[PDB]
């Protein structure tokens, strides 16, 4: 039961700047509400589906052939996310390489990458840590926008090559490869978080940050942005909507208890996210005190917030080299575990559909890894931060919400929630209670539909700190988002057009499970009765 205790890289990297962007404490209410309402029930649903059917994301829809486009959509979303997930790991490797010294590079203002405006004690970017991150690592000062991105840096190129080589050699021989990664992933982050929290509570000015964190702006609610952000982050962090959970549960024992796993994972997620936010806001308060600025303008709101905040707190400890090495090793391990999970999801989902790919695992693994490396080459250019921001905004947003809603609607309305409950009782010995059935059938779909409609209606053009993207970038992002959403109606049209018979016959074939198709000739379909749809 050590997989349940494993910490996610999302809770440590993405949650801080999403909480800081939305004012602090106002972000916690929609997050908890969505976790209770739609997060845990659908985690449970995906685990149970994968465990019962022993299939991947694509071939699990043999229970309802019309809904097979959702698996392709989630596989495409996983590929899109993996296209930029590994740049964070490359950054962590670069920082770990830079940490092997007694004079950390982010503490002084006397190096070759420092502008004459760098100050050693809108947005504030003249601090040594921010200057290091933006000029000695990204080299962003040589880029003018998404229209001018330049050539990739060779140091980040070497880091990316190392990352992809490790990823390939950790997957080329199959699943269950003696996953010692989860042992580090379940122990070290707790120690690091405890040490950082205990130290940061005592820093001068941290009280203001804690007060800001524990304050709720009720005007920040009633607007769409915080709800959309919380809903997207819940499913991003829990792993739902990527095909990871179904693929991993397809290897579980038949009588494994998915209820306990769902409960434990949800609790760990909540606790880790809250602690991470507390530590981040303590550091923010200290930084605002020391630089003599407001807390709303002291740091950036992008994907590189932790890479500035955490070295700043590390520099305040005694024995900074040891703590820096430990922290960046932990970050690297978290990233590697997440990337392994995503790659395995893609590979298993695609290999279950085509049986020829099962005899050529090494070649298929090489193809997937090389394609990911070639596509990730775009995000290590001089202006790669803009490409990364675009991908992080448009890869798993409305698309992932729509895919999750389609999965829930399919399972709970066309296959049958009572059939699902009977399937669970067959392998676990007990039947799910009324709360789970109600959440599966009515509560979660309604909230997901509302959030999808609101996200479409209230779209805001993309920005990065003080930089405003051109409109064609927004068009490109919306095209990326739609490329995964269009796959479901396309497959429905193809399945209807590729079946021979009459309208009634094709309609009956599209909704009947593949192993019950002998009932079409007998003309007895449960979906053609009122009791099937009235059943709750
Ligand atoms: C520093 O600030 C001045 C404005 O006072 C600006 O003209 C100059 O370009 C800045 N230098 C850099 C590279 O940060
Ligand atoms: N722009 C930062 C965000 O709006 C924010 C962060 C901390 C605060 O105390 C705040 O009022 C707002
Ligand atoms: N385990 C989910 C995580 O967010 C993740 C990481 C890398 C991926 O390629 C992916 O599809 C999912
Ligand atoms: Cl989170
Ligand atoms: Na992890
Ligand atoms: Na989690």
UniProtKB/Swiss-Prot annotation:
It is a multi-pass membrane protein. The keyword Transport applies. Residues 50-68, 174-176, 252-257, 348-362, 412-441, 489-536 are cytoplasmic. Disulfide bonds join 109-118. Changing residue 363 to A: Decreased homodimerization and norepinephrine transport. Changing residue 81 to A: Decreased norepinephrine uptake. Changing residue 8 to A: Loss of norepinephrine binding. Abolishes norepinephrine uptake. (R)-noradrenaline 1 binds at residues 8, 78, 82, 236. The chain crosses the membrane at residues 1-21, 26-49, 69-99, 153-173, 177-201, 226-251, 258-281, 322-347, 363-383, 385-411, 442-464, 468-488. (R)-noradrenaline 2 binds at residues 20-21, 301. Changing residue 68 to A: Decreased homodimerization and norepinephrine transport. It comes from the Eukaryota. It is linked to Orthostatic intolerance: An autosomal dominant disorder characterized by lightheadedness, palpitations, fatigue, blurred vision and tachycardia following postural change from a supine to an upright position, in the absence of hypotension. A syncope with transient cognitive impairment and dyspnea may also occur. Plasma norepinephrine concentration is abnormally high. This is Sodium-dependent noradrenaline transporter. It comes from Homo sapiens. The lineage of its organism: Eukaryota, Metazoa, Chordata, Craniata, Vertebrata. The gene is SLC6A2.
